[PDB]
Amino acid sequence: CTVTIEVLGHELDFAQDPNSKHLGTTVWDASMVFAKYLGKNSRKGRFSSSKLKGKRAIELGAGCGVAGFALAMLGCDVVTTDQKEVLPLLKRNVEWNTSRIVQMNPGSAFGSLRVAELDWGNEDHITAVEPPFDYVIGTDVVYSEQLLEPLLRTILALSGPKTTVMLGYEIRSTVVHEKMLQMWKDNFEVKTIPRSKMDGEYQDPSIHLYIMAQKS
Ligand SMILES: Nc1ncnc2c1ncn2[C@@H]1O[C@H](CSCC[C@H](N)C(=O)O)[C@@H](O)[C@H]1O
């Protein structure tokens, strides 16, 4: 079971494990909406190559790894993380596609992409990936009320004053939605990226992209 997606004109292959009960063994639609958003906003602004020079990003709950891979393709250095059980598939997908795009574009310089274990809230895991990061990203990592606080605490622990948080999100329970929105509003300055910045094909009304700056 392997999904082939085009990102920045490159055909990538992401292995999946449907034999697994683990949520992260499947590619979720928010990661693809995030990757396609980057492809559309990488010519000018904060995701252009010159503006990403020297920037470091960390992906939380990367699963199969689509979102962090796209960001690394833009020239950002990226540490992609998940729990131990997901890491072998993540490591497989990173290394298989890294060798593909570099053989496809030998002269181009992509950002680095290294896999690390990070259980949300584990201070030892957080210290070990070497924060602070310029970007903290996550796609479809909000779904269960009990995971809101550990994710929040992790994002803050990896952040500094100038850190930007990018969140790909799919609305499910309205109760959880309202708790999540209030939480982000209590901790960040939140903006909701509009439909026009997302690709015409990779856009379902239920998928939202948030971009959040640290609070004053
Ligand atoms: N407490 C926790 N610590 C670290 N990762 C967690 C976690 N709880 C859930 N996750 C991870 O969050 C991911 C949710 S599925 C999202 C996968 C990927 N970002 C995508 O968009 O396709 C899973 O990989 C799961 O392992």
Residue numbers in the entry: 4 to 219
Reproduce, without paraphrasing, sentences from the article in which this PDB structure was first reported.
pmcp97, also known as CDC48 or valosin-containing protein (VCP), is a hexameric, ring-shaped AAA+ ATPase (ATPase associated with diverse cellular activities) that can extract ubiquitinated and nonubiquitinated substrate proteins from protein complexes and membranes. ASPL (alveolar soft-part sarcoma locus; also known as UBXD9, TUG, or ASPSCR1) is a unique p97 adaptor protein that regulates p97 activity by disassembling the p97 hexamer into smaller oligomers. One example is trimethylation of p97 at residue Lys315, a modification introduced by METTL21D (also known as VCP-KMT or NVM-1). Here, we report the crystal structures of a human p97:ASPL:METTL21D heterotrimeric complex and of the plant methyltransferase AtMETTL21D.
To our surprise, AtMETTL21D was unable to trimethylate AtCDC48. Since the AtCDC48:PUX1:AtMETTL21D complex did not crystallize, we analyzed the structure of AtMETTL21D to gain insight into its mode of action. The crystal structure showed AtMETTL21D in a premethylation state and crystal packing of AtMETTL21D suggested an automethylation mode with residue Lys56 from one molecule pointing toward the active site of the neighboring molecule. First, it revealed that the lysine residue pointing to the binding pocket was indeed not trimethylated. However, when we probed our AtCDC48 samples with an anti-monomethyl-lysine antibody, we observed that AtMETTL21D monomethylated itself, as well as AtCDC48 in the presence of PUX1. Secondly, the structure revealed a difference in the hydrophobic cage that accommodates the methylated ε-amino group. Instead of a Val-Trp-Tyr cage, the plant enzyme contains a Leu-Trp-Tyr cage. Subsequently, substitution of leucine with valine in plant AtMETTL21D resulted in gain of trimethylation activity. Therefore, we suggest that the leucine to valine substitution in the hydrophobic cage of A. thaliana METTL21D acts as a switch that shifts the methyltransferase activity from monomethylation to trimethylation.
